[PDB]
Amino acid sequence: SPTGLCGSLTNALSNGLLSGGLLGILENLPLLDILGKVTSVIPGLNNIIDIKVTDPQLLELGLVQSPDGHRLYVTIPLGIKLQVNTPLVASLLRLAVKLDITAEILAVRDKQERIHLVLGDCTHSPGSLQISLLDLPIQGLLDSLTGILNKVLPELVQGNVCPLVNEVLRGLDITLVHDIVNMLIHGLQFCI
Template structure:
């Protein structure tokens, strides 16, 4: 009985001491976990990465890859220009009709379209941005003249010039200025197929024509998509970027 009574008294004293300690302030060097408070909203710490990520995601969700897959390349190569129409179609019609090897192409199809990692450069004065949009695709060409299916690897860069404007309500927007293909960025190489003389002649002929028409064709499809993505960018991201551009502050790391 004495042991049980002593235990009860001890537990009572322990509970009382615990209650008293609970009201004391915690020393500064106490290593107890602190309550986590919600972080306050802050500006993006990586504006360049946020912008290129948003542009890339926007282009993909906007149907960039399907747009590339449906490029009317065969129509362009048809005699008479096919459905390309206009002055360009007429000129191409005359060009292709004078090259018999192109008239025997059964189909030319874009496969495996890719959007590669976007590049971002800030103008020397800090007031503009230049976005490089690198694209990749494979052209499958079928013609009985060479006896096998040819695959051409194609790489092309589109460059978008971004600047800012203020509307009548005083709101600032990030907008598309000039948008064009990067000169000299088109690269076409043979992936498979026997490197015989007929094959090489066909590849050289196709490369010569595609160099003339493909950059402008892709540019005409991609640039409107870029413009559409800019209109739906996050407002906070746009505000932070435009604020940097207005003051000419550098935020794009130079490589």
């Protein structure tokens, strides 16, 4: 069970993401809060769209080292199910969504002596978004929803998961941090 840095870092990121409440965060994404038909406001009724997020899932992290060995890139594959509901109701719709966050880990050498583990870039992996139909002329409602999902979810997921990633990095095992940073800054591969 003891392994090298690469497998240790990977299982360390995964543990922290979970224990940091990643699933909680996926489940609570303000999907339809980040958005000419005001109206709904006006009577007393409201919505009557509703998106429950269920089935949050973290898949297997992936780790590659830069060619110069100075940088790591983490792939954080995530999975949620979306059920479309409507308190005039028997779900309207139901979807499987998959998405990668790519977190970039650097070691950078402070002007004094010290060396720091930095979360560099942390973005959604362009083209990693995937929407499936699980289970009425719903076709119009789909790919409308898909169109919304396509230009809202990735920045929304990024914006909720990347700070967690940042939290997890800083809270890592000190000695693990100290070996990771020393190999990266000396450009030595360990993610082989």
